[PDB]
Design a binder for these strands. Structure first.
Ligand SMILES: [Mg+2]
Ligand SMILES: [Mg+2]
Ligand SMILES: [Mg+2]
Ligand SMILES: [Mg+2]
Ligand SMILES: [Mg+2]
Ligand SMILES: [Mg+2]
Ligand SMILES: [Mg+2]
Ligand SMILES: [Mg+2]
Ligand SMILES: [Mg+2]
Ligand SMILES: [Mg+2]
Ligand SMILES: [Mg+2]
Ligand SMILES: [Mg+2]
Ligand SMILES: [Mg+2]
Ligand SMILES: [Mg+2]
Ligand SMILES: [Mg+2]
Ligand SMILES: [Mg+2]
Ligand SMILES: [Mg+2]
Ligand SMILES: [Mg+2]
Ligand SMILES: [Mg+2]
Ligand SMILES: [Mg+2]
Ligand SMILES: [Mg+2]
Ligand SMILES: [Mg+2]
Ligand SMILES: [Mg+2]
Lengths: 106, 48, 46, 377
RNA sequence: GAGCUACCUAAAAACAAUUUUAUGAAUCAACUCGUCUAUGUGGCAAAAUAGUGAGAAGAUUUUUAGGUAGAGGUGAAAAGCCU
RNA sequence: UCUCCAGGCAUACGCGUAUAACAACUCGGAUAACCAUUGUUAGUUAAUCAGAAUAGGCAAUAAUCACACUAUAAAUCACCUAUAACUUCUCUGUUAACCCAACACCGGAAUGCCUAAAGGAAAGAUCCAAAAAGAUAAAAGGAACUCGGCAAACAAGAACC
């Protein structure tokens, strides 16, 4: 199974292959994290909107950017926005990121 | 060298050495204005 | 309309329609070349 | 009580004085445009042949040529003039080098020639991202800044004139058009301008180089296409200023190749040309985003800095823009000139042996940190 | 001999503004065509000019390369077109 | 400097030195000036502009700001598995007022940007005839013109075979 494979049966086939059970919704622990007001970023809504506008319109010189450019850009901007929380939480310095990394199992 | 065959090179071949040179060049006055370092030459059409 | 401008130059068309490789492709074309060689033409083909 | 008509040239006549008045008529439309977008649109809508200036270029002595095209003075050194656990940064930066060079597993490039170049890109992206993250607590502005990867920075300007030498337009006077289209490896844009490095109207005895020949003799070629003034983002973006630019020298221009080509002296010149061209394009584009152009020169010096690396060695540059009045009409009486500061390239580390980086220099890391710690006042 | 023209194949391109039941619809440019008149008639031109007109998101127009050849080809048949 | 006109700059295809300077004043430009002519000498500079390893496995899901939608004419290598190789800049295009029309032809000629900041000059001098061509204005009348309201009009509306 590689990137371009498109399972005909969708998740049901993927659940069978990996021997996993599906629960709708994210874990309650994860959900409760952002309900806390302290996690809320300063000017969160405006910065996210600016990220969307920059990803889709401002970043390029062209009238209408293409998905092969803004799709990577929107995610990279979001991670940087979330990565700014190191001011509140010094622990976030113990994680790092790599790109285009190969994963494999048998 | 011009007007001669070069030995065809294949992986692992020797270096191509031209012991006597067939290329003749002449230094020419620039028609236009050139930087002081630049020098103009007229060279045979087969010279790289 | 005004006539006389039927030549619309294109080097790709010219060499493909009347060139050396085109003439040698068929025996009739080779005989064309032989005739021009016997006359002494400076230009055997385009 | 005699109302004599003003002594001005005809608007419609076929003369030089009449044409100049028609030039002012067009320029007045720019002065009267409220939006910054209209000013740029009016200033760039007409396309003509322009020299294409490459910040990274193999032409000999391109740095001196670039100064003339920009009216930039280059001063060797740094511009005249918080505990941050240097050990912690050293550990993180060393990890960045090891991660890409020794630890990550990826599908290697097919080319077999990009492998070295791709490796240099990977580490520089890692080094920039981590430092902008680790240094954010000390400098809060970096938290709100925008990090760009290989985004386009564009500047278009007129400087000088020439007489057309041939054709139906022989003898006509035409301005020399230049454009810089640049794609810095990384750049940081902030919403507040940095403090100036010297007062506007600052004067030094150093003289900008004068080139006897035309731009062509330095191998430079003209094309006609869209004129663009771009800072890396559109004018609507709040983050309209620049903080730092990171450039990676192409492998073609790296030290070992240059020595073999016998152009040893060009090792430093390659760095300087990239800094002068890239930073003038960025600061000039920032100034025009604020409404300043040749006929409305900047009231505030515009500042930006760049670190230029070949992947191992690093050089640091500071640029201050004082003049957008580079045209013949606007530069006739101008005492101002643009300033660039640069330092010799120094290695950041020597080699990676085993799983430990060897030869890491703290001094170079401080300069990167000091650049990233610059803040608006 | 299909660099013109007829038809076809492949790869491409262009179409503003204004209205509309939303389209081989309407108004009208660019663009394509060529209704009527005058001029021109060894002419600017071996078919044009100047006006006036027709279509103008389509069975539209246009570009590049290829194809079909005279006992033939092509033809929304004018026995029209194939330098 | 003035008066006036309003398709210009690039690329493609094509053309092949018509490019630029000097010197000439035979020929060429349908005349001069000046050169588009003759002779000599020069020119167009690119790693970014432009041109020029192998064997297997495999794909239901348009475009139109692609979201909502609607539609019908049904509409563009990659990725993976193995094998092999394990650091490179040479070559070619680049000038011009240019091409197809026997001509320095009121013709034909694709795309991008822009509409005057770019590009240009309708008058060799004089005269104010007829006829001829084009433009404007018209007392009273208003199709009486003519094969026909052709052409023109301060009109450009209606209707029927
Ligand atoms: Mg003919
Ligand atoms: Mg044709
Ligand atoms: Mg054909
Ligand atoms: Mg339309
Ligand atoms: Mg219609
Ligand atoms: Mg109509
Ligand atoms: Mg109609
Ligand atoms: Mg037909
Ligand atoms: Mg019939
Ligand atoms: Mg009949
Ligand atoms: Mg002379
Ligand atoms: Mg004569
Ligand atoms: Mg000439
Ligand atoms: Mg000559
Ligand atoms: Mg040219
Ligand atoms: Mg003719
Ligand atoms: Mg003009
Ligand atoms: Mg006259
Ligand atoms: Mg009248
Ligand atoms: Mg009357
Ligand atoms: Mg009657
Ligand atoms: Mg009568
Ligand atoms: Mg009539």
């Amino acid at each position: 199974f590689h990137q371009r494979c498109r399972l005909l049966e969708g998740m049901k086939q993927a659940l069978w292959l990996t021997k996993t059970k599906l629960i709708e919704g994210l874990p309650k622990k994860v959900l409760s994290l952002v309900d806390d007001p302290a996690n809320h970023i300063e000017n969160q809504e405006q910065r996210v909107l600016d990220i969307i506008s920059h990803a889709r319109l401002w970043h390029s010189t062209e009238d209408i950017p293409k998905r092969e450019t803004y799709c990577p850009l929107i995610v990279d901007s979001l991670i940087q926005l979330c990565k700014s929380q190191i001011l509140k939480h010094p622990s976030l310095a113990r994680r790092t990121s790599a790109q285009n990394c190969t994963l494999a199992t048998t | 060298a011009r007007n001669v065959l070069y030995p065809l090179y294949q992986l692992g071949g020797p270096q191509l050495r031209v012991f006597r040179t067939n290329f003749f060049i002449q230094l020419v006055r620039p028609g236009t204005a050139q930087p002081e370092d630049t020098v103009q030459f007229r060279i045979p059409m087969e010279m790289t | 309309r005004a006539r006389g401008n039927e030549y619309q130059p294109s080097n790709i068309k010219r060499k493909h329609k009347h060139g050396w490789v085109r003439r040698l492709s068929t025996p009739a074309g080779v005989q064309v070349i032989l005739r021009r060689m016997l006359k002494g033409r400076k230009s055997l083909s385009h | 009580v005699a109302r004599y008509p003003p002594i001005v040239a005809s608007m419609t006549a076929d003369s030089k004085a009449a044409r100049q008045r028609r030039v002012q008529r067009w320029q007045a439309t720019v002065h009267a445009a409220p939006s910054v977008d209209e000013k740029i649109r009016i200033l760039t809508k007409m396309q003509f042949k322009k020299y294409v200036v490459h910040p990274q270029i193999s032409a000999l002595n391109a740095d001196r040529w670039y100064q003339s095209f920009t009216k930039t003075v280059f001063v060797s050194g740094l511009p005249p003039a918080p505990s941050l656990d240097l050990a912690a940064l050293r550990a993180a930066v060393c990890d960045c080098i090891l991660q890409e060079q020794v630890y990550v597993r990826r599908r290697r490039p097919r080319s077999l020639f990009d492998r070295r170049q791709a490796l240099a890109s990977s580490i520089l992206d890692q080094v920039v991202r981590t430092l902008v993250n680790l240094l954010a607590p000390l400098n809060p502005v970096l938290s709100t800044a925008a990090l760009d990867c290989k985004r386009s920075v564009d500047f278009y300007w007129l400087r000088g004139e020439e007489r057309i030498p041939a054709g139906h337009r022989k003898g006509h006077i035409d301005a020399l058009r230049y454009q810089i289209n640049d794609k810095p490896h990384n750049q940081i844009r902030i919403s507040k301008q940095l403090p100036e490095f010297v007062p506007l109207d600052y004067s030094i005895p150093t003289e900008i180089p004068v080139m006897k020949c035309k731009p062509d003799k330095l191998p430079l070629f003209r094309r006609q296409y869209e004129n663009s003034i771009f800072t890396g983002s559109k004018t609507a973006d709040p983050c309209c200023y620049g903080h730092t630019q990171f450039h990676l020298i192409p492998d073609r221009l790296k030290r070992e190749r240059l020595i073999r080509q016998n152009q040893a002296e060009q090792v430093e010149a390659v760095f300087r040309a990239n800094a002068i061209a890239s930073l003038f394009a960025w600061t000039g584009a920032q100034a025009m985003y604020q409404g300043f152009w040749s006929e409305a020169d900047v009231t505030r010096p515009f500042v930006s800095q760049a670190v230029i690396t070949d992947g191992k060695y690093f050089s640091f540059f500071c640029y201050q823009l004082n003049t957008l009045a580079l045209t013949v009409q606007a530069d006739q009486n101008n005492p101002r000139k643009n300033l660039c500061w640069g330092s010799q390239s120094q290695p950041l580390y020597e080699t990676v042996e085993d799983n430990d980086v060897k030869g890491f220099d703290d001094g170079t890391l401080l300069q990167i940190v000091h650049f990233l710690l610059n803040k608006p006042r």
